[PDB]
Amino acid sequence: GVEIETISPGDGRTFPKKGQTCVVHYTGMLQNGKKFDSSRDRNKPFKFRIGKQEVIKGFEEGAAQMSLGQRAKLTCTPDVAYGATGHPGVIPPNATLIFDVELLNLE
Amino acid sequence: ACFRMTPLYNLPTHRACNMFLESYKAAWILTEDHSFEDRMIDDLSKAGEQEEEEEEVEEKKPDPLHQLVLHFSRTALTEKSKLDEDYLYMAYADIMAKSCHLEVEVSFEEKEMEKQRLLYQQSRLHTRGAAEMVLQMISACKGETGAMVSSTLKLGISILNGGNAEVQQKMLDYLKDKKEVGFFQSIQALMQTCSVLDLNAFERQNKAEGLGMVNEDGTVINRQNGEKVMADDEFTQDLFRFLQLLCEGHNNDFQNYLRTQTGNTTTINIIICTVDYLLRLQESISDFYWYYSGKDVIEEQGKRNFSKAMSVAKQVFNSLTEYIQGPCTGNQQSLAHSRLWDAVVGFLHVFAHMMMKLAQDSSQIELLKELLDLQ
Amino acid sequence: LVYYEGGAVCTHARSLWRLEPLRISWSGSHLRWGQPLRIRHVTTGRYLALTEDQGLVVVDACKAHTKATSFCFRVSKEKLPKRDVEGMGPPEIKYGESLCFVQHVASGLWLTYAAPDPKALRLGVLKKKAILHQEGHMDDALFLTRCQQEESQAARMIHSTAGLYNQFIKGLDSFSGKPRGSGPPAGPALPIEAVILSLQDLIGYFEPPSEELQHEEKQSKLRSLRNRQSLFQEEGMLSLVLNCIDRLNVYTTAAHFAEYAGEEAAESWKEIVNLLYELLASLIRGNRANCALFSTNLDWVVSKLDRLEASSGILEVLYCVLIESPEVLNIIQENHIKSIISLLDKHGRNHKVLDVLCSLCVCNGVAVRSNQDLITENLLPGRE
Amino acid sequence: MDILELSERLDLQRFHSHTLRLYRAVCALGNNRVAHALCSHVDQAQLLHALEDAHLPGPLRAGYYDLLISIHLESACRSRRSMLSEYIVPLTPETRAITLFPPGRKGGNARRHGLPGVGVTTSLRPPHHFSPPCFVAALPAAGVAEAPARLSPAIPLEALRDKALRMLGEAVRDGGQHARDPVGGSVEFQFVPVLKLVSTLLVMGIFGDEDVKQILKMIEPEVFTEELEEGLLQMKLPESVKLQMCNLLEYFCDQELQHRVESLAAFAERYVDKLQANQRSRYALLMRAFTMSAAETARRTREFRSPPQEQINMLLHFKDEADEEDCPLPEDIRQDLQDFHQDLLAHCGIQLEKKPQSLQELVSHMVVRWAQEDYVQSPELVRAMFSLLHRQYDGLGELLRALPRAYTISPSSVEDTMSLLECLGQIRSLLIVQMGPQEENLMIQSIGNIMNNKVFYQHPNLMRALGMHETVMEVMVNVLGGGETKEIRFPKMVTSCCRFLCYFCRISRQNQRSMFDHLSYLLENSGIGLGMQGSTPLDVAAASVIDNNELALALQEQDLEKVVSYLAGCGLQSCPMLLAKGYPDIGWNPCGGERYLDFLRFAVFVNGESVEENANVVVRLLIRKPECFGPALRGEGGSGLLAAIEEAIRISEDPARDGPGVPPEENRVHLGHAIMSFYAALIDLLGRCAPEMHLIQAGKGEALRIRAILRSLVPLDDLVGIISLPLQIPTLGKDGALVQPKMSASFVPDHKASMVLFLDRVYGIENQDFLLHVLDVGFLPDMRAAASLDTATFSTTEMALALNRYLCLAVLPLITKCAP
């Protein structure tokens, strides 16, 4: 489903548990290498509360596994992604997503 | 209840301010006078600061006033099913119309100054196509009464005031070389839609003040909302005033043009349709007399409804006079072979009994003297 | 059948009559009352005749025996052919005045509307069939009115276009089966040069006026363009040319067209298919009413964008439909959107296709969120 | 490849420019659902960099600027623009601080004009609603067309406005340098996209006061001082740039107008308090004047016996100084108003040298100079120019065209005004889109939020001023026009509009009168609009005319002839929807018939009295078109109406003819009941069309003629049979259950009460024999049954309430007029 491929290791001790916002600079990409989303272009970190189901489930389960300041990668299968319906107008249905996750800080 | 209605000092501040704004504008702003039309057209008619250039080309690029007229004659000539309302055109056609006229032993010297100044005011417009654009929006309206036609005819009258010979020549030339039928098709349509006196509408109006309903915002004393009998009297007055202005000055070239159009594909007899309107008006005023035949006195509303109808009938007779003066033998044979006589007999019958009825009292001297000048 | 039909019915080409006398020389002589003269319809080329079975009908020029077709004019209904005058003629009948009556020269029957009114006229628009009656009613007098040169000239091209292209239609489907092989021709030689000449005469006959014309004069040409297109569409030739596209489209290529018509017609196959679309685009462009007919057969034009013989011709026809009828946009489904996108897939980066999509979103300043979402649903996510 | 290469590769430049035109097309007219999706393809960084990309080509630079405006700004801008023409000024302390001129010392009557758009504006404008575009957030769990409307994608506007100022300053300097290679390839492509972005931000009010002072400096750095550098107005710019300049200036003219409106509203707040205080003090002085006065108190106290609307007319009636005798306002208050009437004229340049010194002279001088410099070829530019020129000269008239939309409200209702204006903006924003189930749900709940707002009821004048009744009308006109013949789609939304309009009329007389002007439009739209069930558009027409004798009299015959001709058609075939549902086909529609009849009933009956003119017109149209009566009383082939009512009783009782027989649909039509409801409305119409007794005893010619016509058309013998018909009763039985009939498919007391009025108004009761003869046969068992049903278990049934209204509203009053 969701597997992590570390790009740059973080601290390895502080992990975001249930109950706090997860602040992250993500760079989502399609399976063909055509980038569909990012956050550093908007220059504002993507702040989402953990466990409130405010983000796609693959990103949700991936964000818990790594630690502070860990640049990683996530291979979002269609099961834990938008999947059957996709994202209307952006993501085609039944597509794999790749994320250059970077949990920069916690609050 | 009036002893116990709420006094002003107990009204909420916001509600009082809302009533105050309407009172202020209705008593201080609408009554305010500011005639800027003359200096607007004066500013727009000056091609200043490039006369020193002395451009080689003959063309002579239009001054700002000419550019309005050209733009409006473009919107006039564009092909559209409906001539949609244009509040800009209302504003500028009204400004042009109000910028021309500017109006006890006064001598024959200064009158030769006044009329020549009026000709200068009209020349400032008609040298820039203002006659043609008036003719174009008359044809473009396609017979739909509205603020378009009312402000266009208002401008056509203000440009034709005093029977300007060159303006009539320009309009006649434009009709004769363009050879369009829509102008007279429109004029026929407007003349058919012009309203006459209605007894049923009058009886309903009579019962309106019998109820005398008031409004929530304070109280209005006999509210003077829209009167529905001869509501377009001013529009019929200045439609026939425009037609009279066209043929005034014994313009036999245009008098024969109204009766028939050699250039056009079909000929529309405006003289006959004028008689047809006069006949409708005479039947209406006759029935309006027949409703007051029993009553010895004519109330104030009845008097006003006569004064409005009689003023329109005066305008119609003046226009019919101008169609035949000169004399125009074509129009004289047309009226002779027309239905004018029945309207004449009906008016005479109305005149007789109305003079006897109105001579019985001193409260209808105004109506009776308007009867005298009408006949 | 002739009907005293009112309204905007007789602003069309179907209601023009020609006063055609018998005399070969000086036939255009001024009307003298009570002279023998035929009456003809312009587009169908048929003459009013008093037939034995159906009374007053229009009959072809091969059966106008001058007995049942000739008529006359007069001033009143009281009982009154004169010797021909070699000249213009005295001024007798004017236009818009001088009420005239028409009586059959031989049968003596007078024109009058039929009295009975059926259930069709009870609810539908009034049309009262004129029957050539013995005496009839009183108000059956006629006003004679003119028609302008453009529509008078126009009517013959309706007759010529219908005659020539109908003969092309029957000459076309005559070889619907029976593949050529190498033998003699299936029918008579097709009027290829006559049709091609008529096509190129009509495309320029409906060519929109040049942009550089003054706006004071340009709109005058627009009025003539709308009137001509309206009359041509109204006579059904817009559907008749649609038949031409339908008949030609059944053949996949010029070689396959040669397999049913011949090598002589395979040369002009690619020419005619482009010309017919050009003529259709000329006919339909600029008119909302003429464009409104494509609400039902929208998928008909949509199905032909794949064809390579005339790609831009049909694409232009579709564009002319879309920029003119806002109601067509309410009819476009997902199938049509995927069809249009397939052109970008198959025919490369044709920028005009983007204009087709740009016109499918907004027409006359109103949004169509159904089409906007389908376009974005199918074009944007692929990133191809 | 580098996108700058497209300045040479013209093949792809056209395609990509058309691609950006397609992006603006698919995000045009508020489609923020897709406008969010576009942010993925064109990132914020790409757009912001393309703003400063000085080597981009012409079409690409203008396409990217327009794409940024379309994606991020136009949806909020359009809604804000539509509310820029309204002035809802709340009475607040900062409202009071607003003054016509800045405080200074050059001149009290006419100081130099303040900088337009600079200062505080208190006029209510709803705040913008943006959303940070994120494509990986969880999809909404709710179903389609249930989630709230997608907002405009967010973009940093504090930095965006500073950037917009920056390129505009660069462009002004560069234009002054007369460089041979302007940015974008031409002067037009250098200035037009930037001026578009500045105009859009100005309309949205992103720019602060300092920023506005800057923009006024680049526009004209000499005239607009407060106390190369060449202004934009002196640079010989092309026509396309001139249009954007006109848009900028007309925005500043609107700011000057709104400043005038707010200044006047603040003067009203400062003036009403003094006028109320003086009028209250004069009330006490009038009370004590009885000790030093006589019977002439009435003249001075007529002001206080007159409601405040004409009080302020008399109080302020001192403009021309010939009417100072009636006005009791002291000279200080009079001077105050005359003082504000002079600086207002000075602020509009009425009455009081190459320096323009103000925007009023600046715009006029510039526009005239542009027009005389060269023959302007752009029609849009020409219209924009002379619209500006007209506004500068007609300062007062421009205010006059704005004043009816001005309105002052208490500070306690601002949050409700915001909660209302946002919904109004939803309605206005849905005028430019084809209606669909998503838009339908977006506006029904919007209307529902309008209903539950106190300001909708408290301020009908404000509600009329904003013109909600219009925007709802065109929404209904658009949906009725779409599918006008085949099928009137979205019935749940049509009844939402109609229900809103019906509740709108009942608020006050003026709103009702306003709806009365739209009466003529509603008839033809309701000709086929009756197919849907519920609040039909006809009911809007009926609610517009009911309870107003003035409106009832004002209703004209050409409106009625449409209705009777529509009933003529409705009397010769069934309802088309009923045909489609499998109803047993009948040769006349009872649904549309009764729907017309109730409207005619409201049309000819006002406050318990018939309207004679309406009554005689409708009856002469029914007789002129005899087919409207239905099968019975038709004439040829039509038997008596009694022969119809029992026939409807059998049909209503018998299944497979009562309806389709596949309420079950909660509005299921039962044809057996529909026939006898139609004739019940017909007899109610005839009874309310009956001429009054005072006219009969006066013996009026038409009153006798018409009422005799009613007698001949309605024979009394079959009438008594209708009286004598029985009722279906809830009978105690079957284990104690209340075996009741279905009122939707059975005889009801309403139909008989519809007759009691007719008999009481047409034939009447004069003799005892005919009185008791009709009372004992039919009116007796109805009330004996009422007595039987009047028990501890049956008096609350569905028929018992109908019987109570049937007897106490029609039968027992009749007995009261027949007691002697």
Swiss-Prot record, chain A:
Cited InterPro entries: FKBP-type_PPIase, PPIase_dom_sf, PPIase_FKBP_dom
Main location: cytoplasm
Membrane-spanning parts: none
Signal peptide: none
Top-level taxon in the UniProt lineage: Eukaryota
Gene Ontology biological process terms from the UniProt entry: 'de novo' protein folding; calcium-mediated signaling; insulin secretion involved in cellular response to glucose stimulus; negative regulation of calcium-mediated signaling; negative regulation of heart rate; negative regulation of insulin secretion involved in cellular response to glucose stimulus; negative regulation of release of sequestered calcium ion into cytosol; neuronal action potential propagation
Catalytic reaction equation(s): [protein]-peptidylproline (omega=180) = [protein]-peptidylproline (omega=0)
Keywords, ordered alphabetically: Cytoplasm, Isomerase, Rotamase, Sarcoplasmic reticulum
EC number, as in UniProt: 5.2.1.8
Activity regulation summary: Inhibited by both FK506 and rapamycin.
Tissues/organs with expression: Detected in heart muscle (at protein level). Isoform 1 and isoform 2 are ubiquitous with highest levels in brain and thymus.
Subcellular location field: Cytoplasm; Sarcoplasmic reticulum
Subunit and partners: Identified in a complex composed of RYR2, FKBP1B, PKA catalytic subunit, PRKAR2A, AKAP6, and the protein phosphatases PP2A and PP1. Interacts directly with RYR2.
Protein role: Has the potential to contribute to the immunosuppressive and toxic effects of FK506 and rapamycin. PPIases accelerate the folding of proteins. It catalyzes the cis-trans isomerization of proline imidic peptide bonds in oligopeptides.
Protein name: Peptidyl-prolyl cis-trans isomerase FKBP1B
Gene: FKBP1B
Curated annotation (Swiss-Prot), chain B:
Post-translational modification: The N-terminus is blocked.
Entry-annotated residues carrying S-nitrosocysteine: C2
Subcellular location per the Swiss-Prot or TrEMBL entry: Sarcoplasmic reticulum membrane
Summary of the tissues where the protein is detected: Detected in skeletal muscle (at protein level). Fast- or slow-twitch skeletal muscle.
Residues the record lists as binding Ca(2+): E248, E322
Disulfide bond entries: none
Function field: Cytosolic calcium-activated calcium channel that mediates the release of Ca(2+) from the sarcoplasmic reticulum into the cytosol and thereby plays a key role in triggering muscle contraction following depolarization of T-tubules. Repeated very high-level exercise increases the open probability of the channel and leads to Ca(2+) leaking into the cytoplasm. Can also mediate the release of Ca(2+) from intracellular stores in neurons, and may thereby promote prolonged Ca(2+) signaling in the brain. Required for normal embryonic development of muscle fibers and skeletal muscle.
Family: Belongs to the ryanodine receptor (TC 1.A.3.1) family. RYR1 subfamily.
Complexes and interactors: Homotetramer. Can also form heterotetramers with RYR2. Identified in a complex composed of RYR1, PDE4D, PKA, FKBP1A and protein phosphatase 1 (PP1). Repeated very high-level exercise decreases interaction with PDE4D and protein phosphatase 1 (PP1). Interacts with CALM; CALM with bound calcium inhibits the RYR1 channel activity. Interacts with S100A1. Interacts with FKBP1A; this stabilizes the closed conformation of the channel. Interacts with CACNA1S; interaction with CACNA1S is important for activation of the RYR1 channel. Interacts with CACNB1.
Extra facts: Binding of [3H]ryanodine indicates that the heterozygous channel is activated by Ca(2+) concentrations 4-fold lower than normal. Single-cell analysis of cotransfected cells shows a significantly increased resting cytoplasmic Ca(2+) level and a significantly reduced luminal Ca(2+) level.
Protein name, per record: Ryanodine receptor 1
UniProtKB/Swiss-Prot annotation, chain D:
Location of this chain's protein in the cell: Sarcoplasmic reticulum membrane
Residue stretches in coiled coil: none
Positions of modified residues (Phosphoserine): S610
Recorded consequence of changing R711H: Decreases threshold for channel activation by K(+), caffeine and 4-chloro-m-cresol. Decreases inhibition by Mg(2+)
Additional facts recorded: Binding of [3H]ryanodine indicates that the heterozygous channel is activated by Ca(2+) concentrations 4-fold lower than normal. Single-cell analysis of cotransfected cells shows a significantly increased resting cytoplasmic Ca(2+) level and a significantly reduced luminal Ca(2+) level.
Function: Cytosolic calcium-activated calcium channel that mediates the release of Ca(2+) from the sarcoplasmic reticulum into the cytosol and thereby plays a key role in triggering muscle contraction following depolarization of T-tubules. Repeated very high-level exercise increases the open probability of the channel and leads to Ca(2+) leaking into the cytoplasm. Can also mediate the release of Ca(2+) from intracellular stores in neurons, and may thereby promote prolonged Ca(2+) signaling in the brain. Required for normal embryonic development of muscle fibers and skeletal muscle.
Family the entry assigns: Belongs to the ryanodine receptor (TC 1.A.3.1) family. RYR1 subfamily.
Record's comment describing the protein's domains: The calcium release channel activity resides in the C-terminal region while the remaining part of the protein constitutes the 'foot' structure spanning the junctional gap between the sarcoplasmic reticulum (SR) and the T-tubule. Pore opening is mediated via the cytoplasmic calcium-binding domains that mediate a small rotation of the channel-forming transmembrane regions that then leads to channel opening.
Protein's UniProt name: Ryanodine receptor 1
Gene: RYR1
